[PDB]
Design a protein around this ligand. Structure first.
Ligand SMILES: *[C@@H]1O[C@H](CO)[C@@H](O[C@@H]2O[C@H](CO)[C@@H](O[C@@H]3O[C@H](CO[C@H]4O[C@H](CO)[C@@H](O)[C@H](O)[C@@H]4O)[C@@H](O)[C@H](O[C@H]4O[C@H](CO)[C@@H](O)[C@H](O)[C@@H]4O[C@H]4O[C@H](CO)[C@@H](O)[C@H](O)[C@@H]4O)[C@@H]3O)[C@H](O)[C@H]2NC(C)=O)[C@H](O)[C@H]1NC(C)=O
Ligand SMILES: *[C@@H]1O[C@H](CO)[C@@H](O[C@@H]2O[C@H](CO)[C@@H](O[C@@H]3O[C@H](CO)[C@@H](O)[C@H](O[C@H]4O[C@H](CO)[C@@H](O)[C@H](O)[C@@H]4O)[C@@H]3O)[C@H](O)[C@H]2NC(C)=O)[C@H](O)[C@H]1NC(C)=O
Ligand SMILES: *[C@@H]1O[C@H](CO)[C@@H](O[C@@H]2O[C@H](CO)[C@@H](O)[C@H](O)[C@H]2NC(C)=O)[C@H](O)[C@H]1NC(C)=O
Ligand SMILES: *[C@@H]1O[C@H](CO)[C@@H](O[C@@H]2O[C@H](CO)[C@@H](O)[C@H](O)[C@H]2NC(C)=O)[C@H](O)[C@H]1NC(C)=O
Ligand SMILES: *[C@@H]1O[C@H](CO)[C@@H](O[C@@H]2O[C@H](CO)[C@@H](O)[C@H](O)[C@H]2NC(C)=O)[C@H](O)[C@H]1NC(C)=O
Ligand SMILES: *[C@@H]1O[C@H](CO)[C@@H](O[C@@H]2O[C@H](CO)[C@@H](O)[C@H](O)[C@H]2NC(C)=O)[C@H](O)[C@H]1NC(C)=O
Ligand SMILES: *[C@@H]1O[C@H](CO)[C@@H](O)[C@H](O)[C@H]1NC(C)=O
Ligand SMILES: *[C@@H]1O[C@H](CO)[C@@H](O)[C@H](O)[C@H]1NC(C)=O
Ligand SMILES: *[C@@H]1O[C@H](CO)[C@@H](O)[C@H](O)[C@H]1NC(C)=O
Ligand SMILES: *[C@@H]1O[C@H](CO)[C@@H](O)[C@H](O)[C@H]1NC(C)=O
Ligand SMILES: *[C@@H]1O[C@H](CO)[C@@H](O)[C@H](O)[C@H]1NC(C)=O
Ligand SMILES: *[C@@H]1O[C@H](CO)[C@@H](O)[C@H](O)[C@H]1NC(C)=O
Lengths: 262, 49, 197
């Protein structure tokens, strides 16, 4: 019940400039018309992001399916540009096997699924789509001692738009006091293979009481193909940065919105 | 182990004193090699330090 | 507790022996504090415990704690893995390889065991008090709303003395009160009638 990618190309690990992106709401307190100087784990301005990608296999090139084990450290910044929703979710854990618990968070055809269990993962965890419709999920084989299970409503309707990357998705992941915090933003982009510059602020969406010990991070991607005799990959790029203990100034406007930061 | 797992303790009116030196004060060993402490109160320093 | 409203409440529960009950607190050390269950220094909540020797000391009981570990757990983490502990570092097998130990140790919870070795049930209540909708409130009774008079007040536990009038201000969807630059509360949302005063 796992997809097999027997011959995969090596990752480029190209470095990109983070610009002024990756800032997020760091408090619950309501503020307005005020500037505050705070400290915590944030992505540095003009930091180095590592690029990883997915590429369609051709006669002269092996399939590129970049899914390495990435250190979580003290928090992780994740962003990606896509034309067909290839990236569906992530795996958060330590040893990433059935010895310890891990959290699997992904968006399937009709629902967002959050599970914390002892998983027996596939070598190359993935989802598959065929004939304009969702087909199967090949992330893991077995799951046993599940302690957390939540399902959220949502709709994903992925397709081939034979274009370029039109949307940029941004996430921040932090694991503090037993809670996995997820911050999110979404905006339009017009690039083919780069990281859009600018400034943005991400808002909290999830605060999940896992009690989990995350040290490693992995990305779950979707393969596409009709008739399901075999599957290939579309083009997609994601970028990863790391949060550092920084001091930053943030300005709140009249409605409590962060409009600038230093 | 010399003090915590001794075969015999003195009475309170005639208490004993032992000097400790040239060693590592590893208190996690007492998790396996000693009876649980009903009282463990530090006044000078925090027990976590 | 009976006068407060909380924006979130969590209950964490487990069984330990009597002598280990003292470890369920901030800034503690010991087998439980270090390897099994830890609270943060900035802990907001209550710890409750009671003796259950008559219930949890039956022949079929199975209570364990972690005795061997490399390093320490973080606050509110769990580790339910079960592999052999190699005291020399790394991993091992068989358990007959000298330095191999079973990471878990059972509690000898027999009904005739002396006090301190008897089982206790522990419940930890974690509280949050944010500027957010209450989910849990104490057993208080409400009164009629009075306006234009100096009066004492309590809105979801938020007390003070002053004059209550009708506001023209607007709140965010989940805002319960507003404060100015002196942290003086000048606006509150009435818990029963969705109107800002
Ligand atoms: C979330 O979950 C993860 C996964 O379980 C967990 O990670 C584990 O953390 C523990 C604690 O740090 C690790 O245990 C130690 O690991 C070191 C390092 O070994 C690895 O890494 C080095 C590279 O730095 C590699 O070279 C090596 O081949 C391994 O890959 C070991 O050195 C430790 O053993 C020594 O130190 C122990 C101290 O407690 C001693 O008890 C032990 O006897 C060893 O000491 C001896 O050698 C020393 C040499 O440095 C010497 O100085 C001493 O005097 C003595 O002679 C120990 O095994 C464990 O490996 C991690 N697991 C994995 C898969 O990486 C996270 O910690 C967890 N999160 C939380 C909060 O718990
Ligand atoms: C997750 O779910 C699985 C079930 O799908 C569950 O597996 C069970 O684990 C228990 C361990 O608590 C197993 O019981 C063992 O049986 C063997 C017999 O071969 C005994 O030898 C074991 O005792 C040894 O280890 C003890 C320490 O734990 C020592 O005190 C003792 O002296 C022995 O050395 C133990 O009784 C049980 O057989 C499995 N069941 C199955 C179907 O595999 C697993 O525990 C669950 N995980 C968690 C965290 O609960
Ligand atoms: C971000 O990555 C670039 C690499 O593209 C780093 O630039 C290198 O820095 C080292 C150390 O000074 C030099 O020896 C190299 O010659 C530089 N490479 C290039 C192409 O200029 C840069 O320092 C990194 N920045 C941060 C903050 O890590
Ligand atoms: C945990 O994962 C390991 C793999 O790392 C499983 O062991 C494999 O089991 C398959 C059969 O399903 C064999 O074909 C492999 O050869 C085994 N590999 C190794 C290294 O032993 C193990 O069964 C899984 N355990 C549980 C409880 O799911
Ligand atoms: C997406 O995940 C949901 C949740 O697991 C799947 O819906 C469940 O399907 C099983 C049958 O295998 C039913 O027993 C459950 O009752 C369904 N859940 C709900 C809330 O109805 C759904 O099929 C998955 N979709 C895809 C494309 O994999
Ligand atoms: C809380 O409960 C009170 C009842 O004590 C609700 O009062 C109702 O208010 C509406 C006007 O918005 C009247 O039309 C109803 O007749 C009142 N009910 C009764 C029984 O008199 C109040 O609306 C409730 N508030 C919330 C947020 O649920
Ligand atoms: C494909 O994988 C095999 C290993 O089975 C390896 O020997 C071969 O060189 C790989 N092909 C390419 C083009 O790298
Ligand atoms: C999927 O492709 C088949 C042909 O293989 C076609 O008949 C069917 O209508 C297509 N489904 C959709 C939704 O287009
Ligand atoms: C674990 O997965 C395998 C398929 O790889 C299956 O045959 C086995 O029955 C599963 N175990 C359980 C308990 O279902
Ligand atoms: C605050 O929100 C109002 C709408 O209620 C809007 O008209 C106003 O422009 C916003 N303020 C700022 C600085 O955007
Ligand atoms: C430690 O004391 C116990 C009795 O409580 C005894 O059985 C054990 O043998 C002693 N350890 C040593 C090394 O003498
Ligand atoms: C645990 O205690 C036993 C004595 O009962 C001792 O032999 C063993 O070595 C201890 N374990 C460790 C890791 O020291």
């Amino acid at each position: 019940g796992c997809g097999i990618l027997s011959n995969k190309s090596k990752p480029a690990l190209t470095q990109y400039s983070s610009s002024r992106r990756g800032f997020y709401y760091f408090d619950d307190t309501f503020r307005s018309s005020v500037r505050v100087l705070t400290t915590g784990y944030f992505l540095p301005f003009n930091s180095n992001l590592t690029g990883y990608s997915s590429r369609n296999a051709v006669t002269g090139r092996l399939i590129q399916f970049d899914n390495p084990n990435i250190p979580f450290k003290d928090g992780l910044y994740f962003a990606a540009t896509e034309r067909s929703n290839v990236i569906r979710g992530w795996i958060f854990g330590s040893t990433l096997d059935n010895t310890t618990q891990s959290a699997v968070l992904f968006n399937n055809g009709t629902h967002i699924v959050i599970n914390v269990c002892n998983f027996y993962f596939c070598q190359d965890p993935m989802l598959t789509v065929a004939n304009g419709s969702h087909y199967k999920s090949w992330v893991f084989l077995n799951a046993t001692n599940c302690t957390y299970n939540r399902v959220h409503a949502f709709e994903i309707d992925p397709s081939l738009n034979t274009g370029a990357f039109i949307h940029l998705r941004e996430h921040v992941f932090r694991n503090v006091d037993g809670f996995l915090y997820v911050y999110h933003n979404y905006e339009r982009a017009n690039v083919y293979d780069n990281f859009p510059s600018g400034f943005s602020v991400l808002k909290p969406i999830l605060k999940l009481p896992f009690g989990l010990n995350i040290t490693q991070f992995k990305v779950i991607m979707t393969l596409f193909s009709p008739t399901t005799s075999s599957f290939n990959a579309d083009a997609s790029v994601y970028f990863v940065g790391h949060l550092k203990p920084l001091t930053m100034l943030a300005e709140f406007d009249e409605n409590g919105t962060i409009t600038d930061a230093v | 182990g010399q003090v915590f797992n001794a075969s015999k303790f003195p009475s309170v009116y005639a208490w004993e004193r032992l000097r400790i030196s040239d060693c590592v004060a590893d208190y996690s060993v007492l998790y396996n090699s000693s009876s649980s402490f009903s009282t463990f109160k530090c006044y000078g320093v925090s027990p976590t330090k | 507790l009976n006068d407060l409203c909380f924006s979130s409440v969590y209950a964490d529960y487990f069984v330990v022996k009597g002598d280990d009950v003292r470890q369920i607190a901030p800034a503690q050390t010991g087998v439980i504090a270090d390897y099994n269950y830890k609270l943060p220094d900035d802990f907001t909540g209550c710890v409750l415990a009671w003796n259950t020797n008559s219930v949890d000391s039956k022949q079929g009981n199975n209570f364990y704690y972690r005795l061997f570990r490399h390093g320490k757990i973080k606050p509110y983490e769990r580790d339910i893995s079960n592999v052999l502990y190699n005291s020399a570092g790394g991993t091992c097998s068989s358990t007959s390889q000298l330095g191999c130990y079973e990471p878990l140790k059972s509690y000898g919870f027999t009904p005739t065991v002396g006090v301190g070795y008897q089982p206790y049930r522990v419940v930890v209540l974690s509280f949050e008090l944010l500027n957010a909708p209450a989910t849990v409130c104490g057993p208080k009774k409400s009164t009629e709303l009075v306006k234009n008079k100096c009066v004492n007040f309590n809105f979801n536990g938020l007390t003070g003395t002053g004059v209550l009038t009708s506001s023209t201000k607007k709140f965010q969807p989940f805002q319960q009160f507003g404060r100015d630059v002196s942290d003086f509360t000048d606006s509150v949302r009435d818990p029963k009638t969705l109107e800002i005063l």
